[PDB]
Symmetry: D2
Subunit: 249 residues, 4 copies
Amino acid sequence: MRAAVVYKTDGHVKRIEEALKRLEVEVELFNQPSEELENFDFIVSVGGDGTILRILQKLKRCPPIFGINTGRVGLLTHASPENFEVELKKAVEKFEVERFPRVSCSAMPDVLALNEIAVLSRKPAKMIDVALRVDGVEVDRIRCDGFIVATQIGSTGYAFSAGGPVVEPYLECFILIPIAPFRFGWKPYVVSMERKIEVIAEKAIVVADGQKSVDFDGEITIEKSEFPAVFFKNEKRFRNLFGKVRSIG
Amino acid sequence: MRAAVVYKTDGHVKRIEEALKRLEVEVELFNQPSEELENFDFIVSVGGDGTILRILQKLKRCPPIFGINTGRVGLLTHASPENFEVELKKAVEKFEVERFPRVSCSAMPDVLALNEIAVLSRKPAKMIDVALRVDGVEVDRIRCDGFIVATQIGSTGYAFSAGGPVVEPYLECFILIPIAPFRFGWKPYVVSMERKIEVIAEKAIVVADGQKSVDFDGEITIEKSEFPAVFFKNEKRFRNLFGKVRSIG
Amino acid sequence: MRAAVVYKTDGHVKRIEEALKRLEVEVELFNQPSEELENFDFIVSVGGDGTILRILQKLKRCPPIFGINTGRVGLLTHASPENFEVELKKAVEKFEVERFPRVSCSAMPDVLALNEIAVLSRKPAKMIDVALRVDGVEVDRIRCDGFIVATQIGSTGYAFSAGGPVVEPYLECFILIPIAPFRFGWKPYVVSMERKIEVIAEKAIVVADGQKSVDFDGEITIEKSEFPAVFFKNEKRFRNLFGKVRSIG
Amino acid sequence: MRAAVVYKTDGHVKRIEEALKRLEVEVELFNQPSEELENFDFIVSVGGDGTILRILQKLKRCPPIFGINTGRVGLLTHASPENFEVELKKAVEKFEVERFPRVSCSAMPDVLALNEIAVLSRKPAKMIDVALRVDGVEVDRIRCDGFIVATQIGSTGYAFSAGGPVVEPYLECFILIPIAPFRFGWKPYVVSMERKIEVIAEKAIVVADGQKSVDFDGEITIEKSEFPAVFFKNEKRFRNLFGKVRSIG
Ligand SMILES: NC(=O)c1ccc[n+]([C@@H]2O[C@H](COP(=O)([O-])OP(=O)(O)OC[C@H]3O[C@@H](n4cnc5c(N)ncnc54)[C@H](O)[C@@H]3O)[C@@H](O)[C@H]2O)c1
Ligand SMILES: NC(=O)c1ccc[n+]([C@@H]2O[C@H](COP(=O)([O-])OP(=O)(O)OC[C@H]3O[C@@H](n4cnc5c(N)ncnc54)[C@H](O)[C@@H]3O)[C@@H](O)[C@H]2O)c1
Ligand SMILES: NC(=O)c1ccc[n+]([C@@H]2O[C@H](COP(=O)([O-])OP(=O)(O)OC[C@H]3O[C@@H](n4cnc5c(N)ncnc54)[C@H](O)[C@@H]3O)[C@@H](O)[C@H]2O)c1
Ligand SMILES: NC(=O)c1ccc[n+]([C@@H]2O[C@H](COP(=O)([O-])OP(=O)(O)OC[C@H]3O[C@@H](n4cnc5c(N)ncnc54)[C@H](O)[C@@H]3O)[C@@H](O)[C@H]2O)c1
C-alpha cells in the first residue's frame, strides 16, 4: 500500500521513513507537492497547516492526508514528532477517513479552496466596493479592504481575523465577512454551503487559501465542488478545537 | 376548519376576522395566549415577534402560525396589515408549513424556547462564573453578565446584541456567546444542534425565550427537543433576512 | 507621620506592620474601610483592586493609597507581597503622588466613582431604553441591557467587557458604551471629561464602582467631581498597562 | 483679502465664485491642489473630506479652510450646496479658527497626516508582522494585514473600519488598532499624542491620509508635528459628530 511523504525540510523525515517501513508501506519522498500525489493510497504531510494547503492545490481526487506538525500550532493536522509513531500506527491500521468540502471560484476555474476564497483590493491601502448576492438575492453592498467567503474549516483563519465566529469543523457552512468595512454597522453572515455565492467588485483580486490569486473586474461565482479534502478520522478534532483556537498568534 | 386569532392590543382585528370569515374559516378571538390553542387548525398571531414567542410557550404540539406584524420589524412574521389579506389567502389555500426546532433546559422541564436559553446573574451589575461544556468536553470558562445558548432563529435576537453572527433560518445549529465577558480574547462558537450543551454557574437564573425564568444553582443541560415551532412556509424568508437585520433597533 | 493599613484577610498584616515600623510611621489596623481613613497621612490597602474601590467609597478628601495585590491581578495596585518590602520604602521616602478624577451622580449625591457609573435594568434579562446626551446634544437612544459612563481608569473594567477600548490612565476622558445593544451598528464614544453626561431611562438602577446602587427613573447627570482618587506614583503604570490588560480573566 | 477655491469637478463652483464676489474677495480657481495655496488668507475646498486631505498634503503652514461637502457626509466640512452661502458669509466676517494637529512619520519626512499613518502589507492577501512600541515600551507584537496609528480626527476613518472607537474631535490622542489581526484577543489602545509611536515591520509600506506612500523595511517613528490643520470654527462640530458617524457608508 503506497504512501507519500511531503516535507518543507529534512526535520524528522528519517524517522517517518522508518515508521512507515515498520508498517509494510511503500514510501516515496517529495520536497514539493505535485499532481502525482494522487497515485498513492495516503499522504503524510510534514510541516504544518500551510504545508497541507499547498498539497491540496495539487489534488482533485484527494488521498487521505495524515499531518505531522513541525511548528507550534495546527488545526488541520493529526500529530507531532513527539508522538507521531503511535498516531500513524493507528491511522493506517483503522483506515477511517473524514471529508471537508472544497469550494471553487468561477474566475479561477480549477483550483479549489478548503479555507476560503478571499476577494481583496489590488492596490494595498485602497478600498474596493463589494456587492454580495447569494442564490440571486441582494445580500449586501459595502466598501472594505476585502471580502471573505470561507468554509467552516477556514473560520479559524482570515475569517477569524476579520471578526468571524469559530464554527466547529463538522457543521457545513459559508461564513461571509468583510475586511475593514467602512460602515456604521455590519455582521457576519453564516449560510448553508448548498447556496451559490457571488461577489461583484472592480479593481480586485481573488485568492484561494492564500496560494493562487488572479486579477478580476466584474463578478465571480463561488460554490461547493465535487472534490473534498480527505484526512484521517481525528477522533479528538472537536474537543481540540477550543484550545488551538484559544492560542492563535 | 376553525382558527385562533391571538392579539395584545385591538389591532387590525376587525379586519382579520373579516378576511378569515370570507375565506370561510371559523374564528375564536384570544385576548391573550392560551394552552387551549392546541385545538385549532391554525393560529393567526397579530402583533410582532414577541406575540409569537409567547404563543409558542403554551404549545407543545404546534398548529401553523401566520404571524402579522403591526410594528416596525418582525423576523418571524409573514405579512403586515397592508398585505396580510393576500398572503393569508395564499397561505391557507396551499397550506404548506415549515418547522424550526425548539430547545429544552433542565431547570424548566416542560418549557421550550425557539430563540434561546440565557443564563444570567440573579442580581444585576454582577458577574457569574460560567463554565460551558459541549458533549462531555470542556470548551470554555469565562466570567460574564451571562451566557447565551441560541438557535439560528434567535441568532438575530439577544445573541445578535452580544456580538453574535446572523445565521440564516435554514441552517440548524447552536450559537454560544457570552454577555459582557471579562477577558482579553473571546469568541462566539457556532456548533451543531444535535449536541448536548451544559452550563455550570452559581447564583444565576435561566430564561427561556425571555418568558419563563427560574433561579438555579450548579448544572443545566440544554438540548434539541421533539416538539418544534411550526409556521406557514414563507417563500421569501431568506430574502428578507438581510434587509430586516439592518433595520434592528 | 502616620498610616492606616486596610485589609480583608489578616494574612500579610504582621509583615507590613513591621515594615512600617522601621520607617518611623505609626500604624493602625482596619478590618473594614471607614470614614476615619481621612485622618491618616496615607493608606496601605491589602488585597485586590476591589479593596481599593471599597476604600474610596469612604473617602472624600483622599490621602495617598499604596496598594498590595494579594492573590489576583490588578492595575490599581503598587506591589505584590513578595517584593513590597522594598517598594513601600521607596514610595513613602520619596513621598510622591498622582491623582485620578472621580465622577459623581445625580441619583446618588454624595457618592464617587473612579471606574464608572453603570446604568442597568432593574430586572435581569429585561432590556431598558437608554437615551444619552452630553453637554446638551442628543448623542444616542439605544435599547440595551445597560449603559456605562466610564473613566479612562475603569476602561479596563466593565467597559472593557462591553467591548470598549483600552485607554491609558494619563488621558482624562469619558467612555460611553452600551452593554447588549439591540441595534445593527453601534460604537463607543470617547469624549472629554469636562462634559456633562446625561442618561435617561425608566425601570433602571445606577451603580458606582459595583459598590453602591439606587433605583431610578427619568434622568441622571454624571459630572467630574472635585475629589480625586490619590495614589503614590507608579512610574511603571504605563509600561505595565499593556501586559496586565493581556492577562485579564 | 483674497481666497483660493479648490475643486475636483465643476459642481457648484460658479455659484461659489459669486458668493466670494459679493464679499469683496478676489478669487483664483484651482483644478487641483498646489504648494501655491500657501499664499492666501483662506481656502474653500469643494467636494468632500477627501478633497480636504489632498489640499492639506500640499501645505506646511495652513491658512483657514472652509469645506463645502457636495457629497453625502463630511466630518471635516462646514456646508452643503443649499446653505453654503449663509455659512460662508457668517464665518468669513467672524474669522474664528480651530487647529487640529497633523502628524509626521520618519520615512517620508516632510509629509503630514490629519487622519493617520497606516502601515500596510506590501503585497496584498499577505499579512505582515508589526511590533508596536511607545516611549520605548513593548505594547504589542501581532501578525496582521496592517496597523493604524490614527488621531481623533481620523477615528471616524480607517480606524473606524478596523473596529475603533469614535473620538470627539477636541480630545487629542493617538489610536493604535490593527487591521485583521490573527490573534484570539486584541484591543485598540488610546494613548496621549505627546507620546512617541514606533512601528517595526518587514515587507511593508507606510501611507499617510491615503495619499503619499513609500516602501519601508525596518522601523519607523510617528510623532505630533509642528504645523497643524486649520479650519474656520464649526460651532456645531461636536453636535453633528454623532449623526454623521451613524450614516458612514
Ligand atoms: N489573518 C490574516 O491577516 C490572513 C492573511 C492572509 C491569509 N490568511 C489565511 O491563511 C491561510 C493560508 O494563507 P497564506 O499561506 O497566505 O498565509 P500563511 O499560511 O503564511 O499564514 C496564515 C496562518 O494561518 C494558519 N492557518 C492556515 N489555515 C488555518 C485554519 N484553517 N485555521 C486556523 N489557522 C490556519 C497557519 O498556521 C498560518 O500561521 C489562508 O487560508 C487564509 O485563511 C490570513
Ligand atoms: N438585545 C437584548 O439586550 C435582549 C435582552 C433580552 C431579551 N432579548 C430577546 O428578546 C426575546 C424575547 O424576550 P422579552 O420578552 O424579554 O423581550 P421582548 O419580546 O419584548 O423584546 C425583544 C425585542 O427583540 C425582538 N425580537 C424577538 N425575537 C426576535 C428574533 N428572533 N430575532 C430578532 N428580533 C427579535 C422583539 O420584536 C423586541 O423588539 C428573547 O428570546 C431574546 O432573544 C434581547
Ligand atoms: N465585566 C463585567 O461583566 C463586570 C460586571 C460588574 C462589575 N465589573 C467591574 O468591577 C468593578 C467592581 O464591581 P464588583 O465589585 O461588582 O465586581 P468585582 O470587583 O467583584 O469584580 C471585578 C473584577 O475586575 C477587577 N477590576 C476592578 N476594577 C478594575 C479596573 N479598573 N481595571 C481592570 N480590572 C478591574 C477586580 O479586581 C475583579 O477581578 C466595577 O467598577 C466594574 O468596572 C465588571
Ligand atoms: N475603511 C477603509 O477600508 C479605508 C481604507 C483606506 C483609507 N481609508 C481612509 O480614507 C482616507 C483617505 O483615503 P483614500 O483617499 O485612499 O480614499 P477616500 O478619501 O476616497 O475614501 C475614504 C472614505 O472615507 C472618507 N473620509 C476621509 N476622512 C474621513 C474622516 N476623518 N472621517 C470619516 N470619513 C472620512 C472619504 O471622504 C471617503 O468617503 C484615509 O485617511 C483613511 O482614513 C479607509
